[PDB]
Structure formats: C-alpha cells, structure tokens
Scaffold this active site. Structure first.
Site, PDB file in Angstrom:
ATOM      1  NE  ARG A   1      -3.265  -2.972   0.837  1.00 52.01           N
ATOM      2  CZ  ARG A   1      -3.427  -4.217   0.410  1.00 52.01           C
ATOM      3  NH1 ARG A   1      -2.464  -4.865  -0.174  1.00 52.01           N
ATOM      4  NH2 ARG A   1      -4.559  -4.809   0.566  1.00 52.01           N
TER       5      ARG A   1
ATOM      6  NE  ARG B   1      -2.820   1.596   6.070  1.00 50.77           N
ATOM      7  CZ  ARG B   1      -2.959   0.418   5.447  1.00 50.77           C
ATOM      8  NH1 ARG B   1      -1.935  -0.224   4.875  1.00 50.77           N
ATOM      9  NH2 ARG B   1      -4.135  -0.149   5.419  1.00 50.77           N
TER      10      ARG B   1
ATOM     11  CG  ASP C   1     -11.869   0.231   5.262  1.00 48.25           C
ATOM     12  OD1 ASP C   1     -13.091   0.226   5.346  1.00 48.25           O
ATOM     13  OD2 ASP C   1     -11.224  -0.802   5.364  1.00 48.25           O
TER      14      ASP C   1
ATOM     15  CB  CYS D   1     -21.045   0.578 -25.585  1.00 50.45           C
ATOM     16  SG  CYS D   1     -22.738  -0.033 -25.988  1.00 50.45           S
ATOM     17  CB  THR D   2     -16.421   2.013 -23.064  1.00 49.38           C
ATOM     18  OG1 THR D   2     -16.887   3.132 -23.762  1.00 49.38           O
ATOM     19  CG2 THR D   2     -14.960   2.138 -22.907  1.00 49.38           C
TER      20      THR D   2
ATOM     21  NE  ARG E   1     -22.234  -4.992 -25.083  1.00 50.40           N
ATOM     22  CZ  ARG E   1     -22.832  -4.241 -24.115  1.00 50.40           C
ATOM     23  NH1 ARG E   1     -22.897  -4.613 -22.829  1.00 50.40           N
ATOM     24  NH2 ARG E   1     -23.392  -3.079 -24.445  1.00 50.40           N
TER      25      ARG E   1
ATOM     26  CG  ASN F   1     -23.096   5.621 -29.103  1.00 49.67           C
ATOM     27  OD1 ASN F   1     -22.851   5.554 -30.303  1.00 49.67           O
ATOM     28  ND2 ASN F   1     -22.315   6.263 -28.282  1.00 49.67           N
ATOM     29  CG  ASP F   2     -23.730   2.601 -22.715  1.00 52.50           C
ATOM     30  OD1 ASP F   2     -22.884   2.131 -23.509  1.00 52.50           O
ATOM     31  OD2 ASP F   2     -23.584   2.488 -21.487  1.00 52.50           O
TER      32      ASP F   2
HETATM   33  N1  LIG Z   1      -7.937   2.420   6.912  1.00 53.87           N
HETATM   34  S1  LIG Z   1      -7.598   0.933   7.424  1.00 53.87           S
HETATM   35  O1  LIG Z   1      -6.220   0.789   7.778  1.00 53.87           O
HETATM   36  O2  LIG Z   1      -7.896   0.076   6.308  1.00 53.87           O
HETATM   37  O3  LIG Z   1      -8.487   0.558   8.644  1.00 53.87           O
HETATM   38  C1  LIG Z   1      -9.910   0.675   8.599  1.00 53.87           C
HETATM   39  C2  LIG Z   1     -10.498  -0.312   9.585  1.00 53.87           C
HETATM   40  C3  LIG Z   1     -11.993  -0.089   9.719  1.00 53.87           C
HETATM   41  C4  LIG Z   1     -12.547  -1.445   9.531  1.00 53.87           C
HETATM   42  N2  LIG Z   1     -13.935  -1.462   9.154  1.00 53.87           N
HETATM   43  C5  LIG Z   1     -14.958  -1.474  10.199  1.00 53.87           C
HETATM   44  C6  LIG Z   1     -14.715  -1.512  11.526  1.00 53.87           C
HETATM   45  C7  LIG Z   1     -15.898  -1.526  12.455  1.00 53.87           C
HETATM   46  N3  LIG Z   1     -17.158  -1.510  11.998  1.00 53.87           N
HETATM   47  C8  LIG Z   1     -17.284  -1.470  10.669  1.00 53.87           C
HETATM   48  C9  LIG Z   1     -18.391  -1.435   9.901  1.00 53.87           C
HETATM   49  C10 LIG Z   1     -17.968  -1.424   8.494  1.00 53.87           C
HETATM   50  C11 LIG Z   1     -18.783  -1.405   7.276  1.00 53.87           C
HETATM   51  C12 LIG Z   1     -18.218  -1.385   5.994  1.00 53.87           C
HETATM   52  C13 LIG Z   1     -19.031  -1.365   4.857  1.00 53.87           C
HETATM   53  C14 LIG Z   1     -20.426  -1.364   4.951  1.00 53.87           C
HETATM   54  C15 LIG Z   1     -20.988  -1.386   6.222  1.00 53.87           C
HETATM   55  S2  LIG Z   1     -22.650  -1.387   6.490  1.00 53.87           S
HETATM   56  C16 LIG Z   1     -23.239   0.214   6.955  1.00 53.87           C
HETATM   57  F1  LIG Z   1     -22.845   1.058   6.029  1.00 53.87           F
HETATM   58  F2  LIG Z   1     -22.773   0.546   8.157  1.00 53.87           F
HETATM   59  F3  LIG Z   1     -24.561   0.257   6.943  1.00 53.87           F
HETATM   60  C17 LIG Z   1     -20.180  -1.397   7.365  1.00 53.87           C
HETATM   61  N4  LIG Z   1     -16.600  -1.412   8.493  1.00 53.87           N
HETATM   62  N5  LIG Z   1     -16.241  -1.447   9.832  1.00 53.87           N
HETATM   63  C18 LIG Z   1     -11.593  -2.386   8.895  1.00 53.87           C
HETATM   64  O4  LIG Z   1     -11.754  -3.715   9.414  1.00 53.87           O
HETATM   65  C19 LIG Z   1     -10.219  -1.748   9.143  1.00 53.87           C
HETATM   66  O5  LIG Z   1      -9.368  -2.321  10.142  1.00 53.87           O
END
Ligand SMILES: *NS(=O)(=O)OC[C@H]1C[C@@H](Nc2ccnc3cc(-c4cccc(SC(F)(F)F)c4)nn23)[C@H](O)[C@@H]1O
Ligand SMILES: [Cl-]
Ligand SMILES: [Cl-]
Lengths: 1006, 76
Positions: free
Chosen positions: A10, A470, A533, A589-590, A592, A770-771
């Site tokens: 990353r 990180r 994230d 279309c792009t 496909r 085209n689409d």
């Molecule tokens: N930036 S990172 O180094 O990648 O670390 C980010 C953390 C955050 C984590 N995600 C996490 C942790 C706790 N609760 C949740 C809930 C969700 C999530 C993600 C997508 C959709 C939904 S459903 C909605 F929208 F809430 F209705 C929930 N992500 N969470 C990672 O595990 C990582 O360590």
C-alpha cells in the site's frame, strides 16, 4: 533493486519503486528520542530506509512518558536511546536500528544521508550540525514542539533535485486535431486537465511522426478542451489519431542554511488564518533557546509571569537584530509570546503526532526526490484547544507537576482537565491504521483510565501482512489475529493505566448489529471517533451520532492526502450533510466492445473472472440443491438465458483431470481473444464508415486485431495456466503437485495436440454501439430439456472462488492480469503488470503511516475541544492536508441549518420530538396540535403511510385508537421485533395559518 | 480582478471575478474549468469554508487571493 510487495504493497502505491529503492540506500540519524524523535523514527523505520541510527544519552524521566510511547516506568534512569532501540527495531526487520553513543566528534555525521535534530538539541548545536551537513551534502531537518506550538525546518543543501512534485498520475488524453501553430484539440468533451507549464509527450499522432519520438512539449492552456505546444509545421501536417501523456520534469532547487534562515526565513504556512503568527513564533522559538542559555539549559517555568516577560523582552531584542522577520512597523505579539513561554515545557500528543508525521515524510522526500519538500520553515499552533479558563483555571498551582507521566500535559491544561480526559467514555470504530494511531494517542492522554471512563473499540477484521507497514501496534506474529484485540493489549503495555479499561470487540457496526450497539450503549458515551475505510460505514456512524446526539470525530487518508471533520450536537452539519465526488462509471459499450484504457480491460477481465470461477459455480450449486430453481430463475432473473447456459456448459464440459482444464482454457483464449474479435470485425470492418461517411473506428474506438496463441508470450501463457488452475479448483481436481512452477513445454505438448475449431461468422448478431441505442421463448424450453437431472449428480458440488487480491499463490491476479493484457493486445493498449492490475481490480487504497499519524494528531487536538463542550463554532477546525505539497489548511465547520414553524426555531439535523411510550395515534395528533401548533397531515414509518388527514372517516376510526406499534402491524401486516426500543416517524404538518411547514421528526420511545 | 484556486493535488486555476460575485458564481466558474459540479466543491479561505448564499466580499477576498478546493478522503 528488490522490494517486498507483501509488506509494502500500500505504501508502494504512494511512493513508487524508485523512491523506495533510494530510501533503502539512505542512512538516517535522529538526535533526541523524546516523543517527537520517537514518532519521527517510528514512521521512517516503517517506511523502510537502509538504516536508522538514534542518538540520545539522556536518562529517562517520568515526564518523558507524556508522548514517548516506547518508554515505561521501569526504564527510568537508563538512557532513552538504549531503551528505545529494540522497540523501533521490531517495527521493521528490514531496517537495522543502532545507537550512536557519543556525538562529541561531529565528523561522525558523514556516515549519514539525512540528519534530523529534534527538541533535545540546542540552537547553538543545531547551527553547527547544520553547517557541517550543508557544507558536505548531508540533508538536514530540525523540528521542535513546545506545548500546543511546533515547527520544522528543512535544508536539503545547495543542490537538490525534485523528481516528481506531487505524486499524482500523469494526465493523459486523446487528441482529435493538432493545427500548424500547435493548437491541440481534445477529442469530444474530454478535458486535458493540464496546467500552464506542464510538459507532454505524444504517441499515435499520424502525420507528425517525429512528434511521437519522446520529445517533450511545454503546455500553454487555452481552455478546458485545448492546449498549445508551439509550432509544429516543421514536423509535418496532422492527419488523425493521437494520445498525449504528461511528463514530470526534474527541478533543481536550493536551500539556505539554518543560520541564513534564522534572520531571513522562508515560510510555508500551517494555517492561512494564522499567517501573521509564523514570524512571531519564529522569533519566539529562537528566544526559548536564548532564554535557556541564560538559565543553564532550563526553559521558562510553566505558567510563570516573570519568565514570560523575559521572553517577551528577548523577542523584542531579536526583532531589532533580525529586522526582516516581522518587517516594518509590526509589533511583537506579546500575548502569543507569553503563551509560548507559559507552555514551553508542554509535551502534547496531538502536536507531536502532527510533527512526527510531517517530518518523517520530509525525511522520505529528502532520501528520494519524490514530492515537493518543505521550503524551509513551518510554524504551527493549536491554541483553540485550550479550555475556557472559567471552567479549568490555568495558573502555577493547577499546572504544576504531580509526579506522573501526564505532568507535561498537565503543564498546559491543568490537572482537573487531565482528570476529565481520564473519565471520558469513548467509542472507536476501527482498529486499522487510524485506529492504531488513535489508541496510541489515547494511551498517551490517559483517556479512559479514570474510574468513570472507558474505551470501546470494535473491528471485525484480522491482521494481514501489508497492514504492518502502517498499523504500528501489530507484529508479524500477530498476523491472523484480530486487530481490535491485539491493539488493545499493545497500548496497555504502553500505558498500564488503561489495563482493564479497553473493551475490544470484534463486531462490525451497522443495521445488523443494533442489538449489541443499542440505546443503552450509545447513550452512555461522551463521544465517538471514526477510524474507517469506507463511506457507507461513516454515513452509518454519522446517522447514529445524530440520533443519539453524540459528537463525532471523523478523519480519512488517501496516500499523502488527508482530512479531519468534527460533528458537534446542536451546532454543526453532520458528515452526511455534504456530498463527495462519486466514482466515475465506465460505459457498458466501452467495456463490452470499445476499450481504450487498461482500466477497461481490467474491469472486463475481473468480471470474466467472477463469471468463470465464482458465479457459474454458485449457480450450479443452487440448481442442484433447490428443486424450484429453474422455475424461480424464469420469473425473476433479468438475464435468464445466461444463467441456464452457465449451468449447461458447467455440467457438459466436466473435466476429469488437469489436462482437460488446460484444454478448456486454451479454447477460452480462442473464443475471447480470436473469435469474438473476428465477430466484432465482421460487423465493423477496419475501414467501415459511420452515417456521415467518417471512419467508424476513430477516437475511443480502436480497431482490434485477433490474437494467434503463442505460448512464449507471457500473457498468453499465464491466461492458460491461471485459467486451468482455477477451473481445476472449481472441479476439485488436484493441481500438478502444484508446488511445481508451471512448465512451458508441458503445456505446449497438450496445446499442440489440440484441434482448434475455426471461426464462423454469425450474420444474426447485432452489437450495441452506444448505450442509448437498445439491444440483447423456445430456445429457453430447449435449454431446460438439456439440463442434467440433479439426481444424476448426487453429492456433486463446485467450489466457488472467493476473490483474494493479497495471496500471490492463488492465481487470481495472475489470471486477471493475463486476461486483461490479452484483451489489451487485442486493442493495442499498453499491457500492465501485476502490481498495477492488483491496484485497480482490488480497489486498493494507497496508504502510508506518515499521513495517518498526522491526521490522527489533528483529530486529537479537536478532541480537547469536546472535553470542554465548546459551543462556539469558531473554535473548531476541520482540516485538509497533502503532505506531498506540502499543504495544510483549515476551516471552521458549517452550522447546522435551522428552520421555524409558528414561533418555534429548530435544528433541521439535530432536533426531534421525543414521545415517551407506545402512544395512541389520536393522542399523538392531539399532543401536536395542542403543544406544538401543528396539524399533522401525514405520518409514516419508513416506507409505509400510517395516517393522513385526507383519510375518510371509516379509515380513521380503524386507526385513531391504535398505539403506534399496532398501527404499524395493521398497515405493514408485520410485527415489530421484540428488541426494538425506538421508532422514528416522519411527518408533514400544517402550522396555525394552515400552511405546510417543514418540521423535525418524531422518536417514539417504547 | 484575478483570484486563484489551488486544488488538493497542487493544480492552480485562475479566475476572473468581482468582489460583488456570489460564491455560487465562483463555483460555477470552477465548474466551467474543471468539470466539478458546484455541490461537490469545498472551497476554503482564511479559516472559513465558503457558503452558497454569500459574496466574495463577505469573506474579505482581495485580488490575487488564493482559495483552496479541498476534499474528504475515504481511506483509514
Ligand atoms: N484504513 S484501514 O487501515 O484500512 O483501517 C480501517 C479499519 C476499519 C474497519 N472497518 C470497520 C470496523 C468496524 N465496523 C465497521 C463497519 C464497516 C462497514 C463497511 C461497509 C459497509 C458497512 S454497512 C453500513 F454502512 F454501516 F450500513 C459497514 N466497516 N467497519 C476495517 O476492518 C479496518 O481495520
Ligand atoms: Cl531545549
Ligand atoms: Cl506515484
């Protein structure tokens, strides 16, 4: 020349191979290992430099623990350097960490390429060391933190070359015309997106041939859709075609010495609202050193007036000696300097994190020429973080040391405020990059260590190898364990005051976990902090924070870019109040038929991957286990014909060995990269023309050419290997004692014996251009009668592939890369390697520890504002950063929009009508007219209409006497689940004049 | 007069404006140049986020002032 992708993945997408290769030939020396030094060092060691050497022979003292997260009370009396060394070493096996014993001999500095001087090094010694460095080509950086103030100074010498100013993708674009004067017109509505003075090269420009040779051309921007490159009549005359690609040229720059800059500083501003302060702090920071010379190494006493006046006077003398820093007729800001004196001994976690990230990134710039260095001084303060003295008096008694690790935080904020931090109850959503930094900062604050306080942190994810770059709480041995749990344990080792006070959970937040994260959980908290994230999660937490009236500290990063936002109950907008740019969709279309970028072939390949190895398997399994499946598909699938062919093909082909998988993959190569291409060419030959008589294949439509399989071609070979290996996995066939690398000659003997059926056109097939233009029962009945009866295949299962971007042995990226590149060859698009393909297909977000710590630092300075319940919006700072530039800017949050109904003012985000109990519809309508002056017009639970004033009497008699729960049961035919303790109802209403008026929502408390 | 808009990726946009102009207006000049819809634009200057109702005068924006077009980021 070798970089570990499994670790650095990353970060590599932020810095690049070249920069990281230079970094790995650079020895770094850090002088001072208090908090600032250790923060800088942590970040640089994580990033990966050839070696890190630390110097600090001073004994550890209790107060050093304010921000130095690798010191323990057991270390007291021993040397900082010695004790810290091993803990930095554990961060990155590839970077040795050594201790320089003595710096009596300045000549030792010659061993290093970048020297950093922190807060422990006197100004006199800084000027000496800088002169040694500058005059012998050693890059020099210094930084100092003093309370809520801080600075950094950069001197990379007389000669420094910046190789890439920003780290952004080079601009690129398709050209439709180039006139003789050099005016370049973009194709259609495409924006070139260049800036005056950019440089570009060209390819595919027909008629100007030497213009494609790699020559660069300086850009004069004319509008969004044209730029100019100087006369081109000398190169020929444009016919058609053309793609421009921007090139970053090198830039040579010069730095002055620390000495020259002390009296003619060149500033970069940390916050443009505070620009008049940089000169003043610049004087003040120097004065702290003059002061120390006169007081035998000692800084001003905490909150002491005599010493502050001494400093004010030292500054005044300095502005006479350095007339150029304030300029003509600008007075010394005495209150500012007085605060700098007052706080000089303060060691604040947020500020140390801000400078630690920033200065670490300047170290990496200095090693590599990647990104634009800071040139040359930056000053910073977060004075708005100070509480109101009314609530927390600040003076010599309140701020005095108490013989604890927090003494140098106490020095700024006072004991009672520090105790209030310790009694805070906080929810942290995420334990990844931001999460780990956040918990480290909280450990240093003692946040949640008081008997009324606590921390909850939740994260359902486990630790993967690239995380270690990180997420500095994790070790190689923690890989596979859960982030929140390991993190929690790690920070208790750092500050044992938190032992027993962190609840680490492994649950995800969202609608499905509201039984765990319930009314009682949320209402108990003081505030919530995101460490997430993605956007949907942030949106969910924001919504809950609005509903429970809790502040929210939000942040995010993307490479060197970052931001902070604060959401304050009854004061600001929320996160979801504003929109961010959406992800641009590629037209169908792009993808496909007419791809012109590798992004297109990758999307196509990824989707073929899904279908081949996941979707087709899932379908077969459903069909074999669900006796209604065929009937279910017919009424409900959009694509019926597709689903049935995918079952039919999956069950007739049925390989018995690996050799059969090779054959299937070779035939797929022929279908996808030979036959389908010949077909598209049957419908549109090379020379084919459009309605107006213009050539069809121009601009974005690049005329393809079919591939002749050639096993010596890497992409052809790997398509077959990966496609065969995945097929094999679907069908449960062992890969060739698959530890074996795939063998060219072995695959070749199989492919060479195959009869590859010839292409026959199909004159029925019409292709969508085209689409807008639309396009695509008895073959269906036929296809059903072709399906095997499921009791023919008893206990037969296909194993679907679950895409996993980060396992290099599993064939997934191997396949997508090869499949993409084969189609790229079809359309004369430059092929891409696995790293690039993985970035795109895997939607990998670029990430580095420097930005993560800095932004986290910024969040932890807004945190102080919540502890004081600040209601003055002007005090809060949303922040925006790009460390590549480097750029910092801040903005006061936006106020929540307000409304009025009758004579009542309300908050459109934050106010609601709270109703206690399962009230009857009639009682609710009555309460609103009597108590709020509102005639309810419409009342709803989610999607369903519960009451409306147009309802006729028969219908009203049915409803009016029902409690809300029963009213919902009547309408939705569905019960309210047992666990549900609240219901939100939306309403429309008329006011006392009978006008529709926008109003708050209702919460029913059951 | 001329003002400058610096993006978070280091790009510099020049605008021809009048302090009588609305923020709404400026956002649409920015749309003309960059293709970014007004409702996605975050402009900041001198410690304030510029709001749709107001004028360039209301934020005290002189000639050759630089405004910053910033973003929120999803990584973490
Ligand atoms: N930036 S990172 O180094 O990648 O670390 C980010 C953390 C955050 C984590 N995600 C996490 C942790 C706790 N609760 C949740 C809930 C969700 C999530 C993600 C997508 C959709 C939904 S459903 C909605 F929208 F809430 F209705 C929930 N992500 N969470 C990672 O595990 C990582 O360590
Ligand atoms: Cl000092
Ligand atoms: Cl890059």
């Amino acid at each position: 020349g070798e970089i570990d992708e499994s670790l650095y993945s990353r970060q590599l997408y932020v810095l690049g191979k070249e920069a990281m290769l230079k970094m790995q030939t650079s020895n770094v020396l850090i002088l001072g290992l208090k908090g600032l030094g250790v923060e800088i060092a942590k970040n640089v060691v994580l990033a990966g430099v050839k070696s890190m050497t630390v110097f600090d022979p001073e004994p550890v003292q209790l107060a050093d623990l304010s921000t130095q997260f690798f010191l323990t009370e057991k270390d007291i009396g021993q040397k900082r350097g010695d004790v810290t060394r091993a803990k930095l070493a554990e961060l990155n096996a590839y970077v040795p960490v050594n201790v320089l014993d003595s710096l009596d001999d300045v000549t030792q500095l010659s061993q290093f390429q970048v020297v950093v001087a922190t807060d422990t090094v006197s100004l006199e010694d800084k000027v000496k060391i800088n002169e040694f460095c500058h005059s012998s080509g050693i890059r020099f950086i210094s930084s100092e933190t003093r309370g809520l103030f801080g600075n950094t100074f950069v001197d990379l010498g007389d000669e420094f070359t910046v190789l890439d100013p920003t780290g952004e993708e080079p601009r690129t674009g398709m050209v439709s015309d180039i006139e003789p004067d050099g005016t370049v017109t973009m194709l259609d509505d495409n924006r070139h997106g260049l800036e005056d003075g950019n440089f570009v090269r060209f390819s595919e420009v027909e008629g100007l041939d030497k213009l494609n040779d790699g020559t660069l051309f300086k850009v004069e921007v004319l509008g969004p859709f044209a730029f100019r490159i100087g006369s081109v009549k000398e190169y020929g005359e444009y016919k058609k075609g053309g793609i421009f690609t921007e090139v970053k040229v090198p830039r040579k720059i010069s730095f002055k010495s620390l000495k020259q800059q002390l009296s003619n500083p060149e500033f970069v501003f940390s916050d443009f609202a505070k620009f008049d302060r940089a000169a003043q702090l610049h004087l003040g920071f120097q004065a702290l050193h003059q002061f120390a010379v006169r007081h035998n190494g000692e800084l001003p006493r905490t909150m002491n007036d005599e010493d502050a006046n001494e400093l004010i006077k030292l500054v005044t003398d300095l502005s006479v000696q350095q007339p150029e820093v304030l300029g003509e007729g600008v007075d010394v800001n005495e209150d500012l300097i007085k605060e700098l004196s007052y706080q000089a001994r303060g060691d604040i976690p947020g500020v140390v994190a801000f400078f630690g990230g920033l200065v670490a990134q300047e170290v990496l710039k200095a090693c590599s020429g990647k990104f634009t260095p800071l040139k040359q001084f930056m000053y910073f303060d977060s004075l708005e973080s100070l509480p109101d003295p009314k609530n927390f008096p600040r003076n010599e008694k309140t701020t005095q040391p108490v013989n604890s690790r927090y003494d140098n935080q106490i020095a700024v904020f006072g004991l009672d405020f520090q105790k209030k931090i310790a009694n805070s109850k906080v929810f942290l959503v995420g334990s990844g990059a931001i999460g780990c930094e956040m918990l480290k900062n909280w450990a240093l604050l003692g946040l949640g260590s008081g008997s009324d306080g606590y921390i909850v942190v939740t994260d359902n994810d486990s630790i993967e190898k690239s995380n270690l770059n990180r997420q500095f709480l994790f070790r190689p041995k923690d890989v596979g364990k859960n982030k929140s749990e390991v993190a929690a344990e790690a920070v208790c080792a750092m500050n044992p005051d938190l032992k027993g006070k962190i609840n680490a959970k492994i649950d995800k937040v969202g609608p499905e976990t509201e039984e765990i994260f319930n009314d009682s959980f949320w209402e108990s908290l003081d505030f919530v902090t995101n460490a997430l994230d993605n956007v949907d999660a942030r949106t969910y937490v924001d919504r809950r924070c609005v509903f429970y009236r809790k502040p929210l500290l939000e942040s995010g990063t993307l490479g060197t870019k970052g931001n902070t936002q604060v959401i304050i109950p009854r004061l600001t907008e929320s996160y979801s109040s504003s929109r961010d740019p959406p992800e641009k969709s590629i037209p169908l279309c792009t993808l496909r038929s007419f791809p012109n970028k590798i992004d297109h072939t990758i999307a196509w390949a990824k989707s073929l991957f899904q279908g081949y190895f996941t979707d087709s398997a899932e379908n077969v399994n459903m069909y074999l286990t669900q006796p209604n499946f065929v009937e279910q598909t017919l009424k409900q699938s959009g694509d019926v014909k597709g689903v049935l062919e995918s079952i039919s093909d999956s069950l007739s082909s049925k390989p018995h060995n690996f050799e059969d998988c090779i054959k299937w993959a070779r035939l797929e190569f022929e279908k996808k990269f030979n036959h389908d291409i010949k077909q598209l060419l049957f419908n549109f030959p090379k020379d084919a023309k459009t309605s107006n008589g213009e050539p069809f294949w121009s601009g974005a439509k690049r005329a393809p050419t079919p591939l002749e399989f050639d096993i010596y071609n890497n992409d052809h070979f790997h398509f077959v290997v990966a496609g065969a290996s995945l097929r094999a996995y679907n069908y449960g066939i062992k890969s060739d004692d698959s530890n074996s690398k795939p063998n060219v000659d072995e695959y070749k003997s199989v492919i060479d014996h195959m009869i590859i059926p010839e292409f026959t056109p199909n004159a029925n097939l019409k292709i969508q251009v085209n689409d807008d233009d639309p396009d695509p029962s008895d073959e269906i009945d036929q296809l059903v009668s072709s399906l095997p009866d499921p009791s023919t295949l008893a206990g037969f299962k296909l194993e679907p592939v679950d895409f996993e971007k980060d396992d290099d042995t599993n064939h997934h990226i191997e396949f997508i890369t090869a499949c993409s590149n084969c189609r790229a060859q079809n359309y004369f698009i430059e092929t891409a390697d696995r790293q690039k393909t993985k970035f795109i297909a895997g939607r990998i977000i670029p990430a580095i520890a420097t930005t993560t710590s800095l932004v986290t630092g910024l969040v932890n300075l807004e945190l102080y504002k919540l502890i004081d319940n600040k209601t003055d919006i002007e005090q809060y700072k949303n922040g925006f950063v790009n460390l590549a530039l480097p750029f910092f800017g801040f903005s006061e949050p936006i106020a929540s929009p307000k409304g009025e109904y009758n004579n009542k003012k309300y908050d459109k985000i934050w106010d609601r009508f709270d109703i206690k109990g399962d009230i009857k519809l009639s009682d609710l309508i009555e309460h609103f007219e009597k108590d709020e002056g509102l005639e309810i017009t419409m009342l709803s639970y989610g999607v369903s209409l519960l009451y409306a004033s147009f309802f006729p009497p028969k219908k009203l008699k049915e409803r009016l006497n029902l409690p809300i729960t029963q009213l919902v049961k009547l309408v939705t035919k569905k019960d309210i689940p047992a666990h549900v303790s609240t219901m939100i109802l939306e309403i429309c209403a008329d006011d006392k004049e009978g006008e529709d008026v926008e109003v708050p929502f209702i919460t029913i408390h059951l | 007069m001329q003002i400058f808009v610096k993006t978070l990726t280091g790009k510099t946009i020049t605008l021809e404006v009048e302090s009588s102009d609305t923020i709404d207006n400026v956002k649409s000049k920015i749309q003309d140049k960059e293709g970014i819809p007004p409702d996605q634009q975050r402009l900041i200057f001198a410690g304030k986020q510029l709001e749709d109702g107001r004028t360039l005068s209301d934020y005290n924006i002189q000639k050759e002032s630089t405004l910053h077009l910033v973003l929120r980021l999803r990584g973490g």
